[PDB]
Write a protein that binds this DNA or RNA. Sequence first.
DNA 1: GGAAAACACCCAAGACACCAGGCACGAGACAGAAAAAA
DNA 2: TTTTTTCTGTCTCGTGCCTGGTGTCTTGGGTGTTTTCC
Lengths: 82, 78, 91, 94, 90, 106, 97
Amino acid sequence: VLRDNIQGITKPAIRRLARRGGVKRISGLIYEETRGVLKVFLENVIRDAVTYTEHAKRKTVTAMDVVYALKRQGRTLYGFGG
Amino acid sequence: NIQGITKPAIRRLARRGGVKRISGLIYEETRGVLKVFLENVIRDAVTYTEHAKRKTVTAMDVVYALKRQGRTLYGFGG
Amino acid sequence: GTVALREIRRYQKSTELLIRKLPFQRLVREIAQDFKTDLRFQSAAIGALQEASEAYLVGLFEDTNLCAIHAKRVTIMPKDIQLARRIRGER
Amino acid sequence: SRKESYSIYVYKVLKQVHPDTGISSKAMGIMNSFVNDIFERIAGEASRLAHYNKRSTITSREIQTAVRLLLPGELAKHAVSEGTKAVTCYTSAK
Amino acid sequence: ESYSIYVYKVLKQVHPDTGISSKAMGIMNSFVNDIFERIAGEASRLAHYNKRSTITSREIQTAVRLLLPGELAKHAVSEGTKAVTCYTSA
Amino acid sequence: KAKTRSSRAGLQFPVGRVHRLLRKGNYSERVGAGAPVYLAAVLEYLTAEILELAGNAARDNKKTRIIPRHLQLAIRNDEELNKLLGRVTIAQGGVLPNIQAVLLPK
Amino acid sequence: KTRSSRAGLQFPVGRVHRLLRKGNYSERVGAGAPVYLAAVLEYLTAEILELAGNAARDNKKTRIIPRHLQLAIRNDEELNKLLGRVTIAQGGVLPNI
DNA sequence: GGAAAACACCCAAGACACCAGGCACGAGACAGAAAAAA
DNA sequence: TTTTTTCTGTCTCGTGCCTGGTGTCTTGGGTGTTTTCC
């Protein structure tokens, strides 16, 4: 079982992602909110991906399903098939 | 006739959105963005009509163009 | 302040992923576990999820930086996060 | 020529759920547009999802999965239950 | 199936001395497939609207004007028209 | 007596019409038998929910007429229905009354 | 003998025709539609590869990288307008301070 | 980075339940219209 | 005075039956990809 793993997304990783976006200063409360946003986004993508796997009578999530699912969320991905 | 979108009308439109105070320079900006949006939708409706071999733009072309831009309109035969 | 611009210059020119692979893998498996058990995952699916989540977070931080710039500040705050999400249409 | 519509059925279900309430013509147009739009969404999702598995048939499974993909939350679950109820009722008769 | 050979041909047409990575090849394949899907689906949607059962050059042309933006589409339309007459004159 | 498929499944929506529209709406060569029944049931449930909430919202307004205003109220006041019908504009529906807290004077 | 040589194209016209026939869009497909679609695809791919080769040359590189594709797409108004909702894997972000 | 385990996706052969197709009947849906209520 | 429910004529599209092909399903084997562990 896995319990309280979202904290594995470290604070320097969020710092690096913000630096990529051009952010100069970062408040201390940003990290928990960012973790929550990432959890919401991942849940939304994973729900559709697991539904696509369940319909095909498969037991493994493939890359194509994840592409199809993000494209269904308006987040089309190039480079992993389609 | 872009000046036909008069100042009280755009004031009313801002007022429906819950806005309390209006800057004096905002009206030209709203006229510009309304012109841009109308330009895009009118262009798409016109080429839809031209493909349909017709000379009169119907409501279906407008609703089609709007729905193709992710702005689906209910109530006009969609 | 100087090293902030140095970090911006370094990371905006680089292309490798900035989220560490194994914690993200465990996070994906932990989230997917509560929808269905004994789920397997292709490596390419995990990589696609990582790339998409990184792109989304980079875009969100850029829009948040614009919001922070608007309020005559240089530090981003959580209120900028929910402002960007609200305007962008997420709930 | 004529043009089909869902007006009579919408009026029937309204009389089922609210016996003392009528409906205006504009609201009838909105309800017709709503039913048509939902129809196109579910049918297109089912057609795509069927095309993914290299299948030629839209069955109850494809419609059920499309409903789970589109409808957000508990609505999907309720819709799925009633749809299954309808199918077995059809299967129980002939 | 993939579009690797044809992308290689047009690449060596426009840039004989430039190579390409495999990830870029996958990106190109995804791009071509996405654009194909968009144009073909919009052309089918136009065919459904006008109560037509045949996809001809016309609906493809109008789909090209509908999707591609600006000058691009014009040159693309011109290119497609040239291909059609090139097909017709061969 | 040739009984309708709608009466066989206990539905008000036309099973035959959705079957014809699926077969004629260029999706796939062949259409399974249970798909029109399932689709009609889903459409029925959804229209029942929308009309129910709209009739209730009209009932708080002491009206016997359902207008687009009540439909817009019913759609926007329900969280999941607002999520589903996010990107649609209801003609003559108006906007929900919403005034910000700090917008008010002191 | 081939339709590609008759149309002066490098993309396979037969492949586009086969995808249109087995793609469940319409009952019939005219002869001019796959030729037109193949020509549009060839022109677009030539344009984006041209801009990518120019960006790679400016970066003193001999092989095109997804970084170069991301730069070529995002530096072009018409292309990035077309590809606004596309995120390129291993593309990074455009340098903007 | 190494080293197994094994689970599960891919592929081939055959069989049949099920969906399209053709066609006749008609009765329920659609428009004309008549009346009621606000 | 006008929006709207109900009655009626009319028609066309749904229902029902038979046929017939075949798409989907099943089974059996195998490699290989992913998980587990140091």
